[PDB]
């Protein structure tokens, strides 16, 4: 895999004794399975707590949440339960295991179950159920000259006084943490994302919060859809961003403001950008969600399984980076084709790990990795987009210095790096396709019959990083046409099809010397006039369904028109650069395309402006 990253089997399946303590007797016990990590650190020392499943890896069985803490960068490990089932049946059970740091406290919360055998979305009732927080003291002692840790665990409190009987209509029934690691929002408040049924057992996600260190909780009035199981949380710029799994569905993202009383889908940035599988037919998955800052820059770390096998496997497990606005591919953390679900994520010191599962024949082990490979990748791309951000914000634009070139919501950027078949994205995040491209200064000149540049948007398939194009965007370019053309020839669009027939919104240009702007499925006005060698400024925008076409900074007659129906929402396949990029279509496009910029919001009047007048401001040619 990465090189220089290592890892070693830390929670050992048929193999890692933990204190089982019964009936006032504690005893060494092998563990079969080990599930449903959650990696953290509490002031220096790190804390590995999980599922300690003893006999089998199903879920409804024997648990008790293991917790084995590491003063030494994971290298030695004390090992502890954290948590003991009721001890009611064969079955009793503590279950998904979420955690939350304060200061030098561990709250874990948990479900439990004492003798049901039945998964428990699907229960009819609450008989079986009760909601428990556990609070681990960590204290460190220097005696001897050595770094000792301690971890008390206080008894577990019973939460479920602060669960109503009745939510914004519904009964409820039962409710859980979402598994892993939450959150001390910034105002101190405890936070955890909750996945909660109700009477007709359906599954939705909720905020479930305290405002006085856990001694009471509360609920947030809004909710995710129905459907959104363990919800992992982060707090990004003031606001709690919700990532949900959706079983057989892509992933929902969710923006929440107030402790959950709205929530608001993430259309434009992460909701639906993860499908559970290739073919996003599949179960999903539990995953680590954070924010860190790495060099300086607050970032965002999220992984999923790919889950090529279907079903529960879930091999292939991968980490991403963002920053809200581009959206990168670090790569498989587990090792080839191993099945490999859960995941928790620690970045520690300015070192990387990952505390993740490995399942052979429903034997379920934890391994705990040493990401070097994954972190330097990551070093590098933010160092990217550093350097592009900064770039292009340190112009001085044509006023001393104009407004400067605006960078918020900036996704990628087509410039002067190509190989001989890609246009390469200097944000490292997605690629275009090309054919009959030659490089130039800052961009591509294009011929013939199938010419072109394609830059993928669902054709990114499984991972579909630029999905916010279907709500907002903003395609920005230079263009240069080199010859008159036989009939309308395409320059630059969104496509809703794969042939680019069918277009969301384009530009074209045809023998009269016009343009010929394309508004959805609308008739098209020839207007305006161009002229061959003379290089123009194109932007295209879209937002809350309508675009616009502008030349030169200023829009098209006739820009402004609705291009997407109001019963749906677009499925755009690809955005086409400097020709359509397929042999099929019989058009001719000679043209020269330079610096394409792709927004996640449609850009103002100001910003548009300040585009055009510095156009030969912005290649990465000289930098």
Same mark, same amino acid.
């Given at each position: 895999?990465a %090189?220089?990253? $290592?890892?070693?089997?830390?929670?050992?399946?048929?193999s890692?004794?933990?204190?089982?303590?019964?009936d006032?007797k504690v005893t060494?016990?092998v563990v079969?399975?080990?599930?449903?990590?959650?990696?953290?650190?509490?002031?220096? /020392?790190?804390?590995?707590?999980?599922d300690?499943?003893?006999?089998?890896?199903?879920?409804?069985?024997?648990?008790?949440?293991?917790?084995?803490?590491?003063v030494?960068?994971?290298?030695?490990?004390?090992?502890?339960?954290?948590i003991?089932? *009721?001890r009611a049946?064969?079955?009793?059970?503590?279950?998904?295991?979420?955690?939350?740091?304060?200061?030098?406290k561990?709250?874990?919360?948990?479900?439990?179950?004492?003798?049901?055998?039945?998964?428990?979305? #699907?229960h009819?009732?609450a008989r079986?159920?009760?909601?428990?927080?556990?609070?681990?003291?960590?204290?460190?002692?220097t005696?001897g000259?050595?770094?000792?840790a *301690?971890?008390?665990?206080?008894s577990?409190?019973? +939460? @479920?006084?602060?669960?109503?009987?009745?939510?914004?209509?519904?009964?409820?029934?039962?409710?859980?943490?979402?598994?892993?690691?939450?959150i001390?929002?910034?105002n101190?408040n405890?936070?955890?994302?909750?996945?909660?049924?109700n009477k007709? @057992?359906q599954?939705?996600? @909720?905020?479930?919060?305290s405002?006085?260190?856990?001694?009471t909780?509360?609920?947030?009035k809004?909710?995710?859809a129905?459907?959104?199981?363990?919800?992992?949380?982060?707090?990004?710029?003031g606001?709690?961003? &919700?990532?949900?799994r959706?079983?057989?569905?892509?992933? +929902?993202?969710?923006?929440?403001?107030?402790?959950?009383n709205?929530?608001?889908?993430a259309?434009?940035?992460?909701?639906?950008?993860?499908g559970?599988?290739?073919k996003?037919?599949?179960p999903?998955?539990? *995953?680590?969600?954070?924010?860190?800052?790495?060099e300086g820059?607050?970032?965002?770390?999220?992984?999923?399984?790919?889950?090529?096998?279907?079903?529960?496997?879930?091999?292939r497990?991968?980490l991403?980076?963002?920053?809200?606005?581009?959206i990168?591919?670090?790569?498989?953390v587990?090792?080839?084709?191993?099945?490999?679900?859960?995941?928790?994520?620690?970045?520690?010191?300015?070192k990387?790990?990952?505390?993740?599962? &490995?399942? $052979?024949?429903?034997?379920?082990?934890?391994?705990?990795?040493?990401?070097?490979?994954e972190?330097?990748i &990551?070093?590098s791309?933010?160092?990217?987009?550093?350097?592009?951000?900064?770039?292009l #914000?340190?112009?001085?634009?044509?006023?001393?210095?104009?407004?400067? /070139?605006?960078?918020?919501?900036?996704?990628?950027?087509?410039?002067?790096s190509?190989?001989?078949?890609?246009?390469?994205d200097?944000?490292?995040?997605?690629?275009?396709?090309?054919?009959?491209?030659?490089?130039?200064?800052?961009?591509? @000149?294009?011929?013939?019959v199938?010419?072109?540049?394609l830059?993928?948007? #669902?054709?990114?398939?499984?991972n579909?990083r630029?999905?916010?194009?279907?709500?907002?965007?903003?395609?920005?370019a230079?263009?240069?046409?080199?010859?008159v053309?036989?009939?309308? $020839?395409?320059? +630059?669009?969104?496509?809703?099809?794969?042939?680019?027939?069918?277009?969301?919104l384009?530009?074209?240009?045809?023998?009269?010397?016009?343009?010929?702007?394309?508004?959805?499925?609308?008739?098209?006005?020839?207007?305006?006039?161009?002229?061959?060698?003379?290089?123009?400024?194109?932007?295209?925008?879209?937002?809350?369904?309508?675009?616009?076409?502008?030349?030169?900074?200023? %829009?098209?007659?006739? $820009?402004?028109?609705?291009?997407?129906?109001d019963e749906?929402?677009?499925?755009?396949?690809?955005?086409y650069?400097?020709?359509?990029?397929? *042999?099929?279509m019989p058009?001719?496009?000679r043209?020269?395309?330079?610096?394409?910029?792709?927004?996640?919001?449609? +850009?103002?009047?100001?910003?548009?402006?300040?585009l055009?007048?510095s156009?030969?401001? &912005?290649?990465?040619?000289?930098?």
């Amino acid at each position: 895999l990465a %090189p220089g990253s $290592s890892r070693v089997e830390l929670f050992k399946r048929q193999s890692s004794k933990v204190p089982f303590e019964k009936d006032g007797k504690v005893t060494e016990r092998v563990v079969h399975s080990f599930r449903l990590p959650a990696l953290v650190n509490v002031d220096g /020392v790190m804390v590995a707590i999980a599922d300690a499943r003893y006999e089998t890896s199903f879920d409804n069985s024997l648990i008790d949440t293991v917790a084995k803490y590491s003063v030494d960068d994971g290298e030695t490990w004390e090992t502890q339960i954290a948590i003991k089932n *009721s001890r009611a049946s064969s079955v009793s059970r503590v279950v998904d295991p979420t955690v939350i740091v304060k200061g030098n406290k561990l709250y874990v919360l948990v479900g439990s179950y004492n003798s049901s055998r039945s998964y428990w979305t #699907s229960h009819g009732d609450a008989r079986d159920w009760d909601i428990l927080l556990a609070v681990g003291e960590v204290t460190k002692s220097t005696a001897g000259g050595k770094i000792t840790a *301690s971890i008390k665990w206080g008894s577990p409190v019973s +939460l @479920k006084e602060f669960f109503p009987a009745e939510m914004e209509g519904m009964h409820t029934n039962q409710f859980l943490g979402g598994a892993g690691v939450a959150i001390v929002a910034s105002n101190g408040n405890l936070v955890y994302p909750v996945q909660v049924t109700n009477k007709k @057992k359906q599954v939705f996600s @909720k905020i479930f919060y305290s405002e006085d260190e856990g001694k009471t909780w509360k609920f947030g009035k809004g909710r995710s859809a129905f459907g959104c199981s363990e919800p992992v949380a982060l707090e990004w710029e003031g606001k709690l961003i &919700i990532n949900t799994r959706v079983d057989y569905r892509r992933r +929902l993202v969710y923006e929440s403001s107030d402790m959950g009383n709205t929530w608001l889908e993430a259309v434009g940035t992460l909701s639906r950008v993860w499908g559970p599988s290739p073919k996003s037919n599949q179960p999903g998955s539990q *995953s680590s969600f954070t924010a860190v800052t790495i060099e300086g820059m607050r970032v965002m770390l999220f992984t999923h399984p790919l889950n090529f096998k279907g079903r529960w496997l879930r091999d292939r497990l991968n980490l991403w980076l963002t920053d809200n606005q581009r959206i990168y591919n670090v790569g498989q953390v587990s090792i080839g084709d191993e099945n490999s679900a859960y995941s928790s994520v620690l970045y520690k010191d300015d070192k990387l790990y990952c505390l993740h599962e &490995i399942n $052979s024949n429903e034997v379920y082990s934890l391994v705990f990795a040493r990401l070097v490979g994954e972190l330097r990748i &990551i070093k590098s791309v933010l160092q990217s987009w550093k350097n592009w951000d900064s770039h292009l #914000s340190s112009i001085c634009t044509p006023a001393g210095c104009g407004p400067a /070139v605006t960078t918020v919501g900036l996704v990628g950027f087509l410039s002067h790096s190509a190989t001989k078949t890609e246009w390469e994205d200097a944000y490292r995040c997605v690629n275009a396709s090309t054919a009959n491209a030659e490089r130039v200064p800052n961009g591509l @000149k294009f011929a013939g019959v199938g010419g072109g540049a394609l830059w993928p948007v #669902s054709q990114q398939g499984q991972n579909q990083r630029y999905h916010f194009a279907n709500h907002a965007f903003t395609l920005v370019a230079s263009v240069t046409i080199h010859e008159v053309p036989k009939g309308a $020839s395409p320059l +630059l669009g969104a496509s809703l099809d794969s042939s680019g027939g069918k277009k969301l919104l384009g530009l074209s240009y045809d023998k009269r010397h016009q343009w010929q702007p394309i508004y959805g499925s609308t008739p098209v006005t020839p207007t305006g006039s161009w002229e061959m060698g003379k290089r123009y400024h194109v932007v295209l925008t879209m937002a809350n369904k309508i675009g616009s076409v502008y030349i030169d900074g200023e %829009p098209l007659e006739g $820009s402004g028109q609705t291009v997407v129906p109001d019963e749906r929402t677009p499925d755009i396949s690809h955005f086409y650069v400097g020709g359509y990029k397929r *042999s099929g279509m019989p058009t001719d496009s000679r043209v020269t395309v330079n610096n394409v910029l792709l927004y996640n919001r449609q +850009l103002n009047a100001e910003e548009i402006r300040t585009l055009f007048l510095s156009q030969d401001l &912005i290649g990465t040619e000289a930098h």
